[PDB]
Every structure is written in structure tokens, then in C-alpha cells.
């Protein structure tokens, strides 16, 4: 049985997501334009990423119990989560027809060769596409989508966390909501091992994040916020 507090936590996260993700993609007009030379797509995706960092921050703030953390713990959690939660969010625009991210128009349909033109090797792109395909194949309810983003953000084992017990306590509450959700609301055969498969997607994102942490004249073409978050 899903408790009242649990459905409230879902209701919150759905709304929080609605406010931080605009599926019209109308703000994309404001970015430096996409040019399709080396790194011709870098400015445009760096802006997208920057804009997306902001949205993730808006979303995080609405996670129940996140405001109860110190501003330091909030800051480190978002520093580490940003890129993961972006790859997550992006599943919404991602389509398996093309294996591309389709954001309403040709100019904003981003394929492997676009990501490449932002200066990225197949070493990152490939784990990244396998991830989007795997996640799409899960076929999450929008409820499970937002819980997974929340859970991803509020992880006690991220570098720089002071009060892990509190981070952990906030997270536990979300996972329990998700686990109880799946039982009560996800029917079979989709429900099969869907929690352990989701937690796996969380491990694939940590890797992607760490591989990205490894991968000056390019640092200029990024944004202030992006440089602040990725160092």
C-alpha cells in the first residue's frame, strides 16, 4: 500500500519536473547556434548543458527534505549529480528510431556525430547511447522517472558530502517510495526486477560521470556555470 506521504512525494516530484522541463524546447532559440570544422557544435551544446544544469537545480530544490540539508551538502550533491541528471532528463527527448535527441526540430535533433563535434570520443558517446537505449527499454512511468532523478541527486556517497546520514535518510525515503510504487502501480511483466534495473542505471551514470571527469581554448567556449560545476 502506497501511503499518503508517499503519493505526496510523487505528486511533488511530478510537478517539480513539469516546472523544470519544458517539452516545447522554446528556450533553445537563445543558445549560441548549432554549426554543423572541429568543435563546431561545442558552443551550442555547452549552452544546452548550462541551461540544463539550471533546470536540474530548480528540480532539486523541490525534492522533499533537500532544503533541510546544509547549503554545502546541497552544493556538492548538485556538483556531482548535475551531469548524471542531465543524461537522465535527456531520455525524454531521446528516440531509438534515430538514436538521437530530438528537441522539436532538425536544428535541435542531436545525433552521435553532433556530440562528436562538441569534442567527444566514442569512448563516452558509446556508453552514453547504450545507457539511453537501456533506459528507454525500461519504459518508466513518469513517476518512476522523477523518483530516479531525485534518488540520483541525493546520494550519500558523492564526493564532499558532510552529513551522509541525512543525505541517506532523505534518499531512503525516496527509494521506498519507488519500491512501493512499482509493487502497487507497475504491472507485470514491466515490473520485473525494475527497481534493481533502475539502481543499475544509477551505477551506469556514475561511470559515465567518472569517464567524463577524465575526458583552455575550449574552456572559453563553455559557460561560467558549467565551469563552476565541472571545475
Amino acid at each position: 500500500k502506497l501511503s499518503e506521504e508517499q503519493q505526496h512525494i510523487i505528486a511533488i516530484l511530478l510537478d517539480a519536473h513539469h516546472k523544470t522541463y519544458d517539452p516545447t524546447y522554446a528556450d533553445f532559440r537563445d543558445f549560441r547556434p548549432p554549426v554543423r570544422s572541429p568543435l563546431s557544435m561545442l558552443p551550442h551544446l555547452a549552452d544546452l548543458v548550462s541551461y540544463s544544469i539550471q533546470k536540474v537545480i530548480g528540480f532539486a530544490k523541490m525534492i522533499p527534505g533537500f532544503r533541510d540539508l546544509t547549503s554545502d551538502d546541497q552544493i556538492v550533491l548538485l556538483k556531482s549529480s548535475a551531469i548524471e541528471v542531465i543524461m537522465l532528463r535527456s531520455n525524454q527527448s531521446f528516440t531509438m528510431d534515430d538514436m538521437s535527441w530530438d528537441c522539436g526540430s532538425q536544428d535541435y535533433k542531436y545525433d552521435v556525430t553532433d556530440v562528436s563535434k562538441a569534442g567527444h570520443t566514442l569512448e563516452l558517446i558509446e556508453p552514453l547511447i547504450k545507457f539511453q537505449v537501456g533506459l528507454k527499454k525500461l519504459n518508466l512511468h513518469e513517476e518512476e522517472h522523477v523518483l530516479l532523478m531525485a534518488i540520483c541527486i541525493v546520494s550519500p556517497d558523492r564526493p564532499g558530502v558532510q552529513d551522509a546520514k541525512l543525505v541517506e535518510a532523505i534518499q531512503d525515503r525516496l527509494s521506498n517510495t519507488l519500491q512501493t510504487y512499482i509493487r502497487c502501480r507497475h504491472p507485470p511483466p514491466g515490473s520485473h526486477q525494475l527497481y534493481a534495473k533502475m539502481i543499475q542505471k544509477l551505477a551506469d551514470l556514475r561511470s559515465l560521470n567518472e569517464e567524463h571527469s577524465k575526458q583552455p581554448e575550449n574552456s572559453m567556449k563553455l559557460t561560467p556555470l558549467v565551469l563552476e560545476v565541472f571545475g
Binding site: I57, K61, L78, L225, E228
Partner: peptide
């Protein structure tokens, strides 16, 4: 170290 991050939070 993180003024823009802390601004978007507060």
C-alpha cells in the same frame, strides 16, 4: 568557490 551555484539555490 561556488557563488553561482549557491545563488541559484538561495
Amino acid at each position: 568557490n561556488h557563488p553561482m551555484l549557491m545563488n541559484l539555490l538561495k
